[PDB]
């Protein structure tokens, strides 16, 4: 047996596996349990710590994926399938993964913890895009990723009940963070240098750990890629969550205790079958079961918590891809398709705005339409299509990110910001979608270093830069290379100068103001309109 | 007759006139000044529609300008050309309904396209005798026949008790119409062509031209129109009947006064008493608002200009319309705290928010909020230079640029040939501070060709420029097309259309075609802000 692959954590002994990365080997410990399986009577309940086990637990293979929607619309289409479960589904899914250098690091090593996205209804830490071997092998990082419960299983809430209090999916993530604190030193990891990073719902999750005090003792730095805890999709009120749970119960044949009991009798796939049917409006970029403002995990709305919080001793990296909104249009807006250019009419544009801004009044939707129309080409289908994409991306990601950045920076945080502008040469989504939601991730994780993946040389070199930025941030709270070139420097985001950088094949370029005029509209004016 | 110059004697419907031979830089022109076209609207005629001048006997001397209609005179800045060039330059009187005619000398042998100028001044001031409206250059250089009339302003021109016999409103516009009619009947005596008449005017004068386009009885009196920095639609050029009634009733109270009794009492007040109080009846603290303006009476204006431009057939109308680069700057020093002509007028964010309420005086809190958020630069929300300039743009866009863009849009969509410009040259002689840019009113001296007078110290470039402009305007008056049919070489001026939205820059450089008349911003003013009002 290889000593390198044998590790004792508090629960018992594990055996991992030597994996091949392009530059040499890494030690990988996959499918480590961190919670009692949340099954039967534990459905909807907070996670409990995993009981100690005997002998040597095999940790050479990924565990099951938490029960979720599986996309079948386009069999064999990489653009969808790459996000689908790549192991069997099960409610028994609370496992985490650890990659380290081989041999184990000599000194304590900064740790990166990945929290995946997928609208809080989907995702797994086992997807190929989340493979930690490149970061471990090239940058020497200890990289951790956990499964957390998604959909009803993870966020169905009857607020105030003891058996379905909500947010148990975020409690799963927190327990995984507790586990890293307790155990990661045995892998060569430094528990005193832990960086969370995540994308979309994963980024929103990261932000919710920033805003939830018991999580703050578990990490030191944070990265939010294309998502935020604030904004229109990442949380619901207690009353809306109650409504959604109650309707879903009705839809599958069911006081809180009796209602949750009957829910616990239903096959997992019955809940997934009706998951979406409880959304109040015809919408896109809306997910039925998400974190709930409970007065507990979230003491208040994220909007309220980022406005009033002290973020003095926090470092944060945040950013967006060039085309945040395009991916979502094909899931609900008539006229849009992955299989044609989706050149839409003006009528389709006004109808699309109601779907992409589902909570907007007639008057508010009117303001959006008039702001995003180009009045020199008010009927040009191509402008209208690109405008539809912009409406959804700004409302849901870019302006919530600008809002968070400025609030953090103003209240003491050290903030770095980016826009990612390179379209992967290998993308199977059509060209009109540009740089879609989620297609920076593979570069950050360093997938282009895998020659068999048929990326370009430029892309390999790009990925190495991004791995450096991110691991420099994790080591130091600053993405800049602490000695090497130099330059141009990546400056901190501030309210005065509002500087951010472009991440693309050319060298860093510093820009100022993140959709400043347009996010003023979303962030300062439209709210005055509801009010 | 007998020993007089025989080429200066002329008969019109009311009798014989003697004009005067004037010197223009390049030669003589004929001028017939101070021709009466109405009975003096004095005494019991105050506030009433004009009556046509009854014929006179003998030869009326028409060699000097007549009285200016009774109005406010600006006295704030002793010896300041910037205000003084606009002030009355002849005696103030209610007896003021005269017009002026310039032609070549000798008079033209064949019928000659006529231009009629309608002055601005917020409907509370102005005169056809100001130096800046001098017809001699257009007459001499382009062979134009140019007419300009006085029309009543302020209370005397626009005070209304709508529905009354004695003060029906809009009599100032009727003064203008009477002059147009006078031209139809009489201009042929001077060699003008009554079948080719182009109105042009600036600010309230442009708004006036617009109202003649929109009032059916005026339509037979002209063929083509020019609207410089003004429109009949928009926030300032008209009031409702209700609001005009309110303003006249308040004014009456303030000077110590059944409509008949009320109006009768107003007619006993000294003219200067009315002038002394006319500004006191405005509903809000404001700039670019005037108490006594055309009223939507359901007569001269059958409906609001907005409704009329939205639904009118304009198929056989040619129009030329435009703006100066800085429409709003001039109005800020008249009542937005923080602005002066005598300093750079850098302002704070607080003064900007305050100024937006004064400059958009009918905006609700939410509307004002939308304005401030649109015009704020969020990379530099506190920069006092950006804020000063934004204040100016708010006031300019709201009052002129976007009303002009609405007008151009509707006319183009509803059959008219439209030509649009922006005028971007600042007179080397301007006495207003530099921060004001090209302010409201300061294209006019170039259109009338003042720079051709060497004694005015304009540059050579400005003299060449004035000549280009005099050609655009007079080609437009002749053909409905500003383009020179012989200079096919020079860059062309395309029509404004809804599909391409082309307009040109007027400056020292050759014509440049641009697309979209402040298109995004005017979408806010013209499409969104109204939907908010509801
Ligand atoms: C109009 N209406 C009531 C709808 C419309 C669509 C759905 C969707 C659905 C999901 C799972 C299903 N089963 C497992 C049987 C069946 C349907 C759905 C929604 C969003 C989505 N994505 C955004 C990926 C994918 C699928 C449900 C109700
Ligand atoms: C990847 N991609 C572009 C997709 C993927 C999935 C869908 C939707 C869908 C497809 C197959 C289903 N089953 C086999 C059960 C259930 C739902 C769907 C979503 C919304 C919707 N409405 C809002 C009416 C209707 C259908 C659409 C686009
Ligand atoms: C606040 N308030 C009650 C006001 C404010 C300003 C005035 C103005 C005024 C004019 C002439 C007067 N007399 C002949 C005695 C007296 C006052 C005035 C207004 C505008 C203006 N311009 C825009 C040029 C010039 C003057 C009157 C009342
Ligand atoms: C040319 N220029 C920049 C001007 C011109 C006029 C004024 C105003 C004024 C000046 C002299 C007056 N008289 C000699 C009778 C009466 C009123 C005035 C305007 C507004 C106002 N308020 C809004 C209170 C008060 C006074 C101001 C600036
Ligand atoms: C794309 O395809 C869908 C259906 O497959 C269709 O409804 C839509 O009109 C198409 N769009 C274009 C631009 O052809
Ligand atoms: C200029 O105008 C007046 C001075 O009368 C004052 O209120 C304003 O603050 C001044 N602004 C400057 C000096 O920038």
Residue numbers in the entry:
A (entry chain B): 4 to 257, 265 to 541
B (entry chain A): 1 to 257, 265 to 541
Give sentences copied directly from the paper behind this entry:
The molecular recognition of AChE is intricate and typically involves multiple transient binding sites, aromatic interactions, or non-conventional hydrogen bonds.
To investigate the binding of CV, we determined the X-ray crystal structure of a complex between CV and mAChE, to a resolution of 2.4 Å. The initial, unbiased Fo-Fc electron density map clearly defines the two CV molecules binding at the entrance to the active site gorge of each AChE monomer. The two CV molecules (denoted CV1 and CV2) form a dimer that effectively blocks access to the active site. The dimer is not linked via covalent bonds (i.e., non-bonded). CV1 interacts with the protein through an extensive interface involving arene-arene interactions, electrostatic interactions, and van der Waals contacts with residues Tyr72, Tyr124, Val282, Asp283, Trp286, His287, and Tyr341. In this, both CV1 and the side chains of residues Tyr72, Asp74, Thr75 Leu76, Tyr77, Thr83, Val340 W439, and Tyr341 forms the pocket that accommodates CV2. However, as a consequence of the ligand binding, a significant shift of up to ~3 Å of the protein backbone/main chain in the loop region comprising residues Tyr72 to Phe80 is evident. Based on the structure, we conclude that the cooperativity is homotropic (i.e., occur via the binding of two chemically identical ligands), and that the inhibition of AChE is due to steric blocking of the entrance of the active site gorge.
